[PDB]
Design a protein around this ligand. Structure first.
Ligand SMILES: [Cl-]
Lengths: 15, 97, 274
């Protein structure tokens, strides 16, 4: 079961 | 860039006339784009399948390519691999032992 | 023993045309159970072991949504890292990610992982405390700062200690007939003359699972390490593994040599003699 993408305050956080 | 290591082998001990699977396991390579063919008496075998790309702890990739086959006394097999790290395709004969 | 869930993601840019090729595979221990390939027609997460087909249609829709989101994140990261490394648009590059969790013999969380490579080299990794990051180079310091400021380790830890373990336990139970079965290696020795005076003894370990195994030769009950040829463990293609080890010996002296096989499926190691 995959994780969700890194998200903070409604917005995704990438490298 | 890291060059592919190659093993060519059958799934089961080769017995002439008995159906089996010919495998070519490529591993330890980077980047992932690679061309692998299984050859019978020099000629590319069609419809060879492969596993889904995965990788080891050191990030190097591994793939298994395979096909059903029935070994006979006279037929020769090999695995042909091309990769950016190689000047021309590497070809390894299937040695039954 | 412990068990593991792992996902392995590979995204490769295609500078000549189009978006990156993305492949995701999921494993429990040494068993692949799902895949996604952006080049395939279905655009779905697909089953690769029978026990995952026990999950309902909502599972496949959810894992497809999540894996396609992961593909977009890797596409973004390829662009970002091209910039961090001041690379041109002409070359192909690779972002790999692995993440997952282990449970112990106690059925509780044991450890978690979440780490990345760029062009086949370590880039950033979550440390064992799941609370801090290891950056391999100065480029990755940028990401490490961004992720510390965003406090993203907390949500990763939540998944790794919680959701990940819960689903690993579910899979282990659903798949118990294979996932929680050990297959001890089927072992035998072959003998080949290489001359009238020397022969090769080859010790085979066949059809075993999981993949971890050790094969060693002894002569007169002491290790015979330097004179052993050992092939890397290789997949049979049916979900089990194979390995062999060989030694060349003077013919007539075969009885001095023993092969020793250690594997989790063997309550005591096996000793084989010609
Ligand atoms: Cl391209």
């Amino acid at each position: 079961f995959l994780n969700k993408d890194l998200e903070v305050d409604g917005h995704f956080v990438t490298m | 860039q890291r060059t592919p290591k190659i093993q060519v082998y059958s799934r089961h001990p080769a017995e002439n006339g008995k159906s089996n699977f010919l495998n070519c396991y490529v591993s330890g390579f980077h980047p992932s784009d690679i061309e692998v063919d299984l050859l019978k008496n020099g000629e590319r075998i069609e419809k060879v399948e492969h596993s889904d790309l995965s990788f080891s702890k050191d990030w190097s990739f591994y793939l298994l390519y395979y096909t059903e086959f029935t070994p006979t006394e006279k037929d020769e097999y090999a695995c042909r691999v091309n990769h950016v790290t190689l000047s021309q395709p590497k070809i390894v004969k299937w040695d039954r032992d | 023993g412990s068990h593991s869930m792992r996902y392995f993601f590979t995204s490769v840019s295609r500078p000549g045309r189009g978006e990156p090729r993305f492949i995701a595979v999921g494993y429990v221990d040494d068993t692949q159970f799902v895949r996604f390939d952006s080049d395939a027609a279905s655009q779905r997460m697909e089953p690769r072991a029978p026990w995952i087909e026990q999950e309902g249609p909502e599972y496949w829709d959810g894992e497809t949504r999540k894996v396609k989101a992961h593909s977009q994140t890797h596409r973004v990261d390829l662009g970002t890292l091209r910039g961090y490394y001041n690379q041109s648009e002409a070359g192909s590059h690779t972002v790999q990610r692995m993440y997952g969790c282990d449970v112990g013999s106690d059925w509780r969380f044991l450890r978690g992982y979440h780490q990345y490579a760029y062009d086949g080299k370590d880039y950033i990794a979550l440390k064992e405390d799941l609370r801090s990051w290891t950056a391999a180079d100065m480029a990755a310091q940028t990401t490490k700062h961004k992720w510390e400021a965003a406090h993203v380790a907390e949500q990763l830890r939540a998944y790794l200690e919680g959701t990940c373990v819960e689903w690993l336990r579910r899979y282990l139970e659903n798949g118990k007939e294979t996932l929680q079965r050990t297959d001890a290696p089927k072992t035998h020795m072959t003998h080949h003359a290489v001359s009238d005076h020397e022969a090769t003894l080859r010790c085979w370990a066949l059809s075993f699972y999981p993949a971890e195994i050790t094969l060693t030769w002894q002569r007169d009950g002491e290790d015979q390490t330097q004179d052993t040829e050992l092939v890397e463990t290789r997949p049979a293609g049916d979900g089990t593994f194979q390995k062999w080890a060989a030694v060349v010996v003077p013919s007539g002296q075969e009885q001095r040599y023993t092969c020793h096989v250690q594997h989790e499926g063997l309550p005591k190691p096996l000793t084989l003699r010609w």
